[PDB]
């Protein structure tokens, strides 16, 4: 939490499309409508309860620290994956990690699976957990 908290302020510049140092229950949908698809108004009211302080830039930060909470580092993850690669190839086989995620631990379901590998980096059978790791941590791109 350092330099991009100022960037959350830069990403406060488009929050504030109409400039009021705030964003009404529709200010948000206005910015959304101006570029892609449009969120529900009941997707505007049913969420009225996530703001321990209405909403500005210093509340956009703090109403998100409920989701970015419970994460592990980039080296911590790229080591958990390293626990299944004794030969230090920086690569798990595809059928292996899949079996690993689907049939052991907290078994992924048909969907979470379908969704995790949809954009997973796999070349000639090998799954790159290093590169994959970055994707998952904002060091790469989703």
């Amino acid at each position: 939490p350092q330099k991009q908290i100022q960037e959350m302020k830069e990403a406060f510049s488009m929050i504030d499309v109409d400039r009021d140092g705030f964003v009404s229950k529709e200010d948000i949908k206005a910015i959304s409508e101006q570029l892609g698809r449009a969120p529900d108004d009941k997707e505007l009211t049913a969420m009225l309860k996530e703001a321990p302080g209405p909403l500005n830039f210093t509340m956009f930060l703090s109403i998100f620290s409920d989701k970015l909470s419970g994460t592990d580092s980039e080296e911590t993850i790229r080591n958990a994956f390293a626990m299944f690669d004794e030969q230090e190839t920086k690569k798990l086989n595809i059928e292996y990690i899949k079996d690993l995620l689907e049939n052991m631990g907290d078994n992924f379901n048909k969907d979470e699976m379908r969704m995790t590998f949809k954009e997973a980096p796999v070349e000639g059978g090998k799954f790159d957990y290093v590169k994959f790791t970055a994707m998952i941590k904002g060091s790469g791109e989703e």
Binding site: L100, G105, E112
Partner: protein
């Protein structure tokens, strides 16, 4: 030692090729065509055990006690069955055909030396072979006849004791050949430096073959007499000389012959016309079919050259020294027995007593015999019986007369043959002193038939003493062993219940007693003899029982059952009286006594003897000798009734083994401590049964053993500890075996299980780790997914390239 040497081709086999099994399930089962059968136990329901037969894969139910223990492959073609873990009817019958089919015919089994008839000559009896057996113990080389003989010779020299080799067995089991070989081998290792002496031990065979041999349904050169040939040696162990003894010659043959059977070869040689010069000396016409004492069964023999053998027989005599006058006396007497059979009579003049129907033959007889056909026939018709101070002229009919003739023939032949044997001995005898001998016996072994008569009894009763002779021996060897190992115990000789059957027969009140007594009486008969038998011995002797019925399909009549060690034998006394004593004109004899022919003269000279009474006498002689010597036993066995090599008839072999002496040798021996190992071997075999008890440092082998047994909860009865080795009751090593494999297997597995434990346990550490590992991997991938699929994230994350 031994390896690949050619001579051992038909002696040893590839121990490595025989090298290319569950005790609980594998076993022998009785099969009607193969004696026994290999089988794998299925289930059990008390005594009701069901199994599978490897050969046909079927099923049959068999009483548990019916089942016989099977030996591990570890004991295939074992040279001496005295070592096999399981020693029985089946394990023996198996180890026998197995070897025999591989070409092996000499198999040990303790003191015995079982030899299965080859029915084909073998490369085993060569000089070089002879040389590798010279001086070697039996455990030092493949089972062979030569070793019984050699180990016999080097036993004589070493111990300075007489040696006796007893060959036995059914007819055609090849005991004569074995005996010749024994003799040859003894001559080939103790030679001296007409012709050589041993040359005559060799040429005596022919003449004796001509009179004691004949073709019979079983064999083609069957010795029909018992023989005890002694060989004597000097102080330097070389052959000093020999002598012979005959026993029960088949007199019957001289006048009767069954289909596919001839009379003694001599009669056919005599009518071979191989020596024309003699036909006139004998008054014979070179066509045997013509004569009625030999034209009964068949006349020729596939492998017998009635002409060659005759020429050789002639030379044999010349090589034996018989003068021509002697050799011819024999020839004449023999030929005359052909005329006696062609001497016919008339019965009904007007009076109803008999009278000759021609003299032409009677004359030819009187000629060769050296008498007066007149005197001859006069006496053959109206004899001069004698009693007290009066000599009556008894008259006899056709029957009495024609039967008299045949009796004269038989009687003459026996007398003759006996003379010949005595003669031959005169030759083979030496006037030098002899230090020790080694005698080879050879008489028909025990045998039971559908109809056993007087003859069979004579033979069985003999082997009876003989078998008792063996047991005694075994008994002696057992003791000296036990005493040797400080473990001697609850004993009594083996020749025990063997004695009762024996007394029932030879002793004063005995059977043969009643027969010889009842023979002095005139109008005695079966019923009178039968009466007296039952009288003195029925319901008073356990060995003597009344006929129970048939134990085989073609068995016949019987009057009494004799409990021989070989089994209860049904003897029918029909005929015994006529057979025992030999009716012959006490008159004719007087005439032939006064014959002018020098030999016929010796043949009928006056004394001062019934068959039964003669035999038990010359048997007493024998046994008294045998007991003053060192035994060796060679059991001859016929594989099948087809002279076919390799063919093995189970029932036939199993049978022999029974009365053979082997199965009893097993039994009398079973009551002691058969299986016996030496502490060393015991340790390296059964430590596995008690590892956790062996203090740890190479302890003394009896202690290791004293412990394995002690710890094994070993019952004191089952075993007994020597000083050099440990003895065990029969089949115990069997249990010690199974108990050995279960454990060995379990131990291995417990190790295999300790190894598996080592592995897993090693990966535990990594599994503990990898958990947190995958735990991270899984959870985070899940946060990222909720994020990505957040309505505020794609929104936000879209809110920024700018």
């Amino acid at each position: 030692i031994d390896f690949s040497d050619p001579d051992f081709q038909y002696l040893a086999v590839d121990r490595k090729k025989l090298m290319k099994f569950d005790g609980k399930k594998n076993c022998w089962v009785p099969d009607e065509k193969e004696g026994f059968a290999s089988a794998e136990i299925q289930s059990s329901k008390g005594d009701e055990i069901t199994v599978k037969i490897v050969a046909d894969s079927s099923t049959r139910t068999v009483k548990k006690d019916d089942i016989q223990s099977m030996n591990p492959p570890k004991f295939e073609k074992l040279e001496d069955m005295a070592n096999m873990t399981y020693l029985n009817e089946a394990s023996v019958l198996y180890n026998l055909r197995s070897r025999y089919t591989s070409g092996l015919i000499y198999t040990y089994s303790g003191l015995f030396c079982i030899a299965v008839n080859p029915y084909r000559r073998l490369p085993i009896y060569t000089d070089s072979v002879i040389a590798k057996y010279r001086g070697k113990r039996k455990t030092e080389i493949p089972p062979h006849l030569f070793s019984v003989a050699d180990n016999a010779y080097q036993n004589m020299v070493t111990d300075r004791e007489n040696q006796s080799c007893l060959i036995t067995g059914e007819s055609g089991a090849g005991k004569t050949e074995n005996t010749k070989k024994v003799i040859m081998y003894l001559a080939k290792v103790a030679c001296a430096v007409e012709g050589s002496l041993e040359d005559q031990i060799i040429q005596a065979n022919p003449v004796l073959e001509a009179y004691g041999n004949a073709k019979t349904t079983r064999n083609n050169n069957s010795s029909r007499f018992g023989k005890f040939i002694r060989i004597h040696f000097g102080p330097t162990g070389k052959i000093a000389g020999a002598d012979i003894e005959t026993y029960l010659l088949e007199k019957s043959r001289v006048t009767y012959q069954q289909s596919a059977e001839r009379n003694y070869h001599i009669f056919y040689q005599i009518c071979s016309n191989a020596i024309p010069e003699l036909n006139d000396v004998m008054l014979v016409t070179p066509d045997s079919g013509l004569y009625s004492f030999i034209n009964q069964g068949c006349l020729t023999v596939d492998n017998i050259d009635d002409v060659e053998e005759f020429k050789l027989c002639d030379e044999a005599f010349d090589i034996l020294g018989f003068t021509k006058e002697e050799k011819q006396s024999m020839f004449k007497c023999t030929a005359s027995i052909l005329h006696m059979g062609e001497m016919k009579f008339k019965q009904r003049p007007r009076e109803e007593q008999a009278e000759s129907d021609g003299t032409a033959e009677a004359e030819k007889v009187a000629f060769l015999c050296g008498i007066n056909a007149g005197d001859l026939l006069k006496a053959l018709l109206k004899p001069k019986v004698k009693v007290g101070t009066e000599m009556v002229t008894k008259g006899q009919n056709m029957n009495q007369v024609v039967n008299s003739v045949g009796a004269l023939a038989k009687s003459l032949y026996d007398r003759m043959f006996n003379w010949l044997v005595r003669r031959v001995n005169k030759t083979l005898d030496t006037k030098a002193k002899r230090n020790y001998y080694i005698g080879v016996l050879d008489i028909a072994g025990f045998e039971i038939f559908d109809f056993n008569s007087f003859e069979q009894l004579c033979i069985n009763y003999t082997n009876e003493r003989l078998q008792q002779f063996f047991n005694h021996h075994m008994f002696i060897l057992e003791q000296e062993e036990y005493k040797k190992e400080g473990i001697a115990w609850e004993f009594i000789d083996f020749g025990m219940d063997l004695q009762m059957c024996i007394d029932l027969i030879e002793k004063p009140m005995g059977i043969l007693s009643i027969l010889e007594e009842e023979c002095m009486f005139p109008k005695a008969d079966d019923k009178s003899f039968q009466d007296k038998l039952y009288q003195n011995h029925m319901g008073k002797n356990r060995m003597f029982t009344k006929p129970g019925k048939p134990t085989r399909p073609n068995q016949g009549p019987a009057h009494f059952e004799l409990h021989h060690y070989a089994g209860n034998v049904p003897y029918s006394i029909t005929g015994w009286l006529e057979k025992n004593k030999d009716p012959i004109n006490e008159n004719v004899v007087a005439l032939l006594g006064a014959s002018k022919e020098p030999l016929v003269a010796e043949l009928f000279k006056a004394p001062e003897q019934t068959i039964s009474a003669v035999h038990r006498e010359s048997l007493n002689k024998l046994m008294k000798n045998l007991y003053s010597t060192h035994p060796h036993f060679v059991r001859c066995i016929i594989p099948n009734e087809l002279k076919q090599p390799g063919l093995v008839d189970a029932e036939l072999v199993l049978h022999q083994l029974q009365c053979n002496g082997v199965l009893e040798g097993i039994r009398i021996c079973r009551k002691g401590f058969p299986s016996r190992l030496i502490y060393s071997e015991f340790k390296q075999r059964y430590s596995i049964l008690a590892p956790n008890a062996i203090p740890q440092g190479f302890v003394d082998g009896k202690t290791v053993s004293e412990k394995i047994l002690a710890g094994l909860q070993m019952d004191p009865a089952e075993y007994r500890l020597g000083t050099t080795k440990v003895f065990f009751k029969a089949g115990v090593l069997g249990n010690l075996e199974e108990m050995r494999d279960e454990r060995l297997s379990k131990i291995i597995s417990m190790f295999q299980a300790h190894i598996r434990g080592y592995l897993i346990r090693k990966a535990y550490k990594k599994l503990q780790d990898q958990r947190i590992g995958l735990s991270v991997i899984q959870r985070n991938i899940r946060k990222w997914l909720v994020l990505r699929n957040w309505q505020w994230w794609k929104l936000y994350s879209k809110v920024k390239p700018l």
